[PDB]
Amino acid sequence: EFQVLFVLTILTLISGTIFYSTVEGLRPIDALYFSVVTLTTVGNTPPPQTDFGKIFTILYIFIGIGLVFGFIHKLAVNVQLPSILSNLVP
Amino acid sequence: EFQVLFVLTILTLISGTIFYSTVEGLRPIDALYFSVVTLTTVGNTPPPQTDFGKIFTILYIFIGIGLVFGFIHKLAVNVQLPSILSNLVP
Amino acid sequence: EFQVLFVLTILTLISGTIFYSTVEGLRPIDALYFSVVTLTTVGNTPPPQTDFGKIFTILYIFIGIGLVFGFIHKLAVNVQLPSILSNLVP
Amino acid sequence: EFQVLFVLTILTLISGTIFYSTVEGLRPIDALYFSVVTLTTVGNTPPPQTDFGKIFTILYIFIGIGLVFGFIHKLAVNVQLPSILSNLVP
Ligand SMILES: [K+]
Ligand SMILES: [K+]
Ligand SMILES: [K+]
Ligand SMILES: [K+]
Ligand SMILES: [K+]
Numbered sequence: 001e002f003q004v005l006f007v008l009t010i011l012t013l014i015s016g017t018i019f020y021s022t023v024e025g026l027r028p029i030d031a032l033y034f035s036v037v038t039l040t041t042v043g044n045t046p047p048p049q050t051d052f053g054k055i056f057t058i059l060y061i062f063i064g065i066g067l068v069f070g071f072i073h074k075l076a077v078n079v080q081l082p083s084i085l086s087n088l089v090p
Numbered sequence: 091e092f093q094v095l096f097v098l099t100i101l102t103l104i105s106g107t108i109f110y111s112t113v114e115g116l117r118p119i120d121a122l123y124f125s126v127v128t129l130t131t132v133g134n135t136p137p138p139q140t141d142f143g144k145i146f147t148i149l150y151i152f153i154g155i156g157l158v159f160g161f162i163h164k165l166a167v168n169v170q171l172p173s174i175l176s177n178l179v180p
Numbered sequence: 181e182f183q184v185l186f187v188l189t190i191l192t193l194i195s196g197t198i199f200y201s202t203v204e205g206l207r208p209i210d211a212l213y214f215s216v217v218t219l220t221t222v223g224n225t226p227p228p229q230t231d232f233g234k235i236f237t238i239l240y241i242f243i244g245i246g247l248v249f250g251f252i253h254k255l256a257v258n259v260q261l262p263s264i265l266s267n268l269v270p
Numbered sequence: 271e272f273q274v275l276f277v278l279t280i281l282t283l284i285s286g287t288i289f290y291s292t293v294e295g296l297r298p299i300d301a302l303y304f305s306v307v308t309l310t311t312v313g314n315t316p317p318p319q320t321d322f323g324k325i326f327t328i329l330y331i332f333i334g335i336g337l338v339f340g341f342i343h344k345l346a347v348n349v350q351l352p353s354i355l356s357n358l359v360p
Contacts, residue, residue: 066166
């Protein structure tokens with residue numbers, strides 16, 4: 001489960017990195033950062049400058065938000081939870 | 091279910107597109123982009139400039155956020171999930 | 181239930197409106213707008229300029245986010261849902 | 271439960287405060303503010319300026335969002351709810 005969500009999230013982020021670095025002309029790290037803060041809904045950046053960028057972003061959000069949060073709802077629920085929970089056992 | 095949420099989400103976005111293009115003077119694509127990133131809570135844009143725009147946005151968020159996320163909670167749960175899940179069966 | 185969440189959300193927004201108009205010097209409508217997009221996590225505005233504003237915002241988010249979304253999870257689930265659901269009955 | 275989430279959230283915020291004040295050169299209060307609005311997904315600030323800041327932020331979001339919202343889903347569900355609910359009993 002977690003491994004699958006891990007991979008699916010990775011692929012989604014790779015696609016965004018490739019897209020924004022090419023169409024919005026961002027350095028790869030900035031393209032990855034934009035993809036991440038957009039899909040996690042933080043959105044602490046300016047918006048895309050091109051219409052292609054805006055259209056892709058709209059579709060990218062609808063298709064990737066569900067997945068990204070599914071992975072997060074497992075990274076801290078089936079991985080980070082035990083680490084602390086089980087450890088809270090004297 | 092999914093088809094209904096699909097339509098409801100579309101209508102909500104059409105209303106926002108019409109509103110922001112008219113009152114905030116945005117090109118249709120920018121009005122749609124603003125509507126989408128606002129309802130999905132990404133918010134990676136400047137805020138509306140007019141009071142009419144601010145008031146509408148407040149009401150638009152409260153009435154459309156629930157719906158938009160309901161659609162997302164189906165687009166990747168009852169459509170994208172099977173595609174990958176069932177496919178994960180050798 | 182809905183009526184209570186309605187009132188609780190209103191009081192929370194009134195407090196934010198009063199606070200930001202006074203400490204950040206915003207016009208009431210802008211103070212309300214900031215309160216709303218902050219608690220719904222859209223965040224499509226610049227951040228507070230004063231330290232008092234930043235500290236209050238931190239506390240305001242932690243105490244009001246749960247409530248605001250609880251109200252939203254009722255405004256479209258126990259009010260908007262029936263309107264469309266029941267109506268989807270020929 | 272609540273006490274644990276309380277502590278875990280505190281530690282996460284302390285780490286962010288230390289990181290952003292050092293690497294992004296922010297005053298402690300601004301570093302704390304950035305950490306808070308980023309993990310709660312409000313994101314009403316400009317993004318980090320350094321690559322180190324961007325990379326850390328990506329990891330910080332994935333590891334801290336689940337926790338922060340878990341705490342919020344308890345601060346208003348097992349603490350703020352009773353205060354109002356039980357009080358709604360004449
Ligand atoms: K958000
Ligand atoms: K934002
Ligand atoms: K911004
Ligand atoms: K923003
Ligand atoms: K946001």
